[PDB]
Amino acid sequence: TQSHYGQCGGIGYSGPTVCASGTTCQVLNPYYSQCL
Ligand SMILES: *[C@H]1O[C@H](CO)[C@@H](O)[C@H](O)[C@@H]1O
């Protein structure tokens, strides 16, 4: 699970894309997405 305020999967990020429960993966930019 990706941490809170962490990048959860933009184009090119194939790591922890699944946010911790309670946090939502919000795509902010095409490559920048953050678990909030
Ligand atoms: C939360 O923690 C993860 C690693 O555990 C980071 O990838 C993220 O940027 C944030 O610091």
Cβ distance 28 to 1 under 8 Å?
no
Ligand 1 centroid–CA 31 distance in Å is 16
Cβ distance 7 to 32 under 8 Å?
yes
Q: Report the alpha-carbon distance of residue 29 to residue 12 in Å, rounded.
A: 12
Residue 32, Ramachandran bin (φ over 0: left; ψ between -120 and 50: alpha; else beta):
beta
Work out the burial of residue 15: count CB atoms within 10 Å of its CB; fewer than 13 is exposed, 13-18 middle, 19 or more buried. Answer: exposed
Between the alpha carbon of residue 12 and those of residues 2, 21, 22, 26, 34, the distances in Å are 15, 23, 24, 16, 14
Atom 9 of ligand 1, nearest CA residue: 6
**Ligand 1 nearest-atom number relative to CA 4:** 1
Q: Report the alpha-carbon distance of residue 5 to residue 25 in Å, rounded.
A: 9
Cβ–ligand 1 contact at 6 (below 6 Å): yes
The enclosing H or E element of 33 equals strand 33-35
Between the alpha carbon of residue 28 and those of residues 20, 24, the distances in Å are 18, 12
